[PDB]
Structure 1
Amino acid sequence: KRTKFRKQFRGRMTGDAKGGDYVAFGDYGLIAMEPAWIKSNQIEACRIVMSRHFRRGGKIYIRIFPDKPVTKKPAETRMGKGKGAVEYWVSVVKPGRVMFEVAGVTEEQAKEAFRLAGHKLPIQTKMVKREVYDEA
């Protein structure tokens, strides 16, 4: 969700995924195919979807975190200054970036929990497997 300590406000810009492997921590993952701003609430929505499906255990890796602060229009005007500190927190996601990864669940169990979590996301996603050992 939100961050503990900060600066308050930010900006905006985009280009292809910088730091997102394929198989770190988990066995199966969920990768972005489009750029977006992942709201804290959309991640929470995806997490609960997966957590419910995998009833007991807890083997969900959320490799993305909402750190970017977004602002708002009080109600009207423009005849004032820069605005709304407390609108919402965001994770800048670019295609390739592993957002989530699961462990201790079958190919079929994972296929679905990701198919479900996909319906809650503002972008198109792809389900993946192993064979990526870059640098450790």
Structure 2
Amino acid sequence: MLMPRRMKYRKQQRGRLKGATKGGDYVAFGDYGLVALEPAWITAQQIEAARVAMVRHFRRGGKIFIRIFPDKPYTKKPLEVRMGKGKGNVEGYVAVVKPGRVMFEVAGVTEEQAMEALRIAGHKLPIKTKIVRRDAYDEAQ
């Protein structure tokens, strides 16, 4: 699954989840999209689970766009240790996702097929999601 090929720094501080998404808020590529309603750290395994769900629904047909990338290192101390003694080991990668962000888009598939696929995908995510269709509003951005 997804992760940065190389990095300038191995560990990043946790930081915040304030506000709406910076950008990525409009349909860019496909016809139908899945937009986040709540802020979260979406994991690489979560992203891949949603993608492969979509992939299976299409029987390899259609096109899938992933508009979030997990570049934030997720760190965790080994089990049953005490506080202190330096920062824990990097154990995975996450993508910071704030409300309004278009995480996924699909195209080249029927409306019924996109809707259901994007619905199944939403079930793999730890947040509430919405299904949207490309609009003049999108194309105007």
Q: What's the TM-score bracket when you normalise by the shorter of the two chains?
A: over 0.9
Alignment partner of 1:5 is 2:6: yes
Q: Equivalences for 1:46-85 in 2 at 5 Å?
A: 46-75=50-79, 76-85=81-90
Q: How does 1:50-129 map to 2 (within 5 A)?
A: 50-75=54-79, 76-85=81-90, 87-129=91-133
The amino acid of 1:8's aligned partner reads R
- Quote how far apart the aligned CAs of 1:80 are: 1.2
Tell me the amino acid that sits aligned with residue 12 of structure 2.
R
C-alpha separation in 2, matches of 1:70 and 1:31: 23
Deviations 1:93-133 (A, max 9, x none): 00111000000111110111011111110000000012212
CA distance in 2, matches of 1:134, 1:39: 31
Match of 1:71, SS state, is strand
**Is 2:118–2:131's contact at 8 Å kept on the other side of the alignment?**
yes
Structure 2 unaligned blocks of 5 or more: none
- How far off is 1:82 after superposition? 1.6
Alignment deviations for residues 48-99 of structure 1 (CA, whole Å, 9 cap, x no partner): 10001011334000111100001112121224112212x1100000011100
Gaps in structure 1 of 5+ consecutive residues: none
Identity %: 61
Task: Classify the secondary structure of the residue corresponding to 2:95.
Answer: strand
Distance 1:63 1:79, change over 3 A: closer
Residue identity matched to 1:41 = Q
The one-letter amino acid of 1:20's match is G
Q: Which has the higher strand share?
A: 2
RMSD of aligned residue pairs (Cα, Å): 1.2
